[PDB]
Amino acid sequence: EVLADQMEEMIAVVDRMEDEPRLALVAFKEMSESWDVVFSYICDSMLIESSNLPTTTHPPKPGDGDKGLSDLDDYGANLVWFYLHETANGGKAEYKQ
């Protein structure tokens, strides 16, 4: 993650069950009330050079956006929306539980 700046980039990990070549991946997350930026590595086969497809964010963003094609990073932002604009299993601050 060659970047300009540190952030408290807490992490989200998941698997794209909904893909047929179902594969796991990972993304970072941080804190901004406007929601936050992300970078995700994507999936594996026998080495990481295998991928799953989802590509896009919810509208809320920290201000900045995921670098480049960032497709699974964008999707990760929407994912942290799902998993962090949680409500059903509590608020953002509860996630740690």
Swiss-Prot record:
<comment type="subunit">
    <text>Semipurified toxin complex consists of at least YenA1-YenA2-YenB-YenC1-YenC2-Chi1-Chi2. The Yen-TC:K9 subcomplex is about 26 nm tall and 22 nm in diameter with 5-fold symmetry and 5 copies of YenA1, YenA2, Chi1 and Chi2; the chitinase subunits may be solvent accessible on the exterior the complex. The Yen-TC:K9 subcomplex has no insecticidal activity. The native complex with additional YenB, YenC1 and YenC2 subunits is 16 nm taller and is insecticidal; the toxicity-conferring subunits are present at about 1 copy each.</text>
</comment>
<protein>
    <recommendedName>
        <fullName>Toxin subunit YenA2</fullName>
    </recommendedName>
</protein>
<comment type="function">
    <text>Part of an orally active toxin complex (TC) with strong insecticidal effects on larvae of the Coleoptera Costelytra zealandica, Acrossidius tasmania and Adoryphorus couloni and some Lepidoptera larvae. The TC has an endochitinase activity.</text>
</comment>
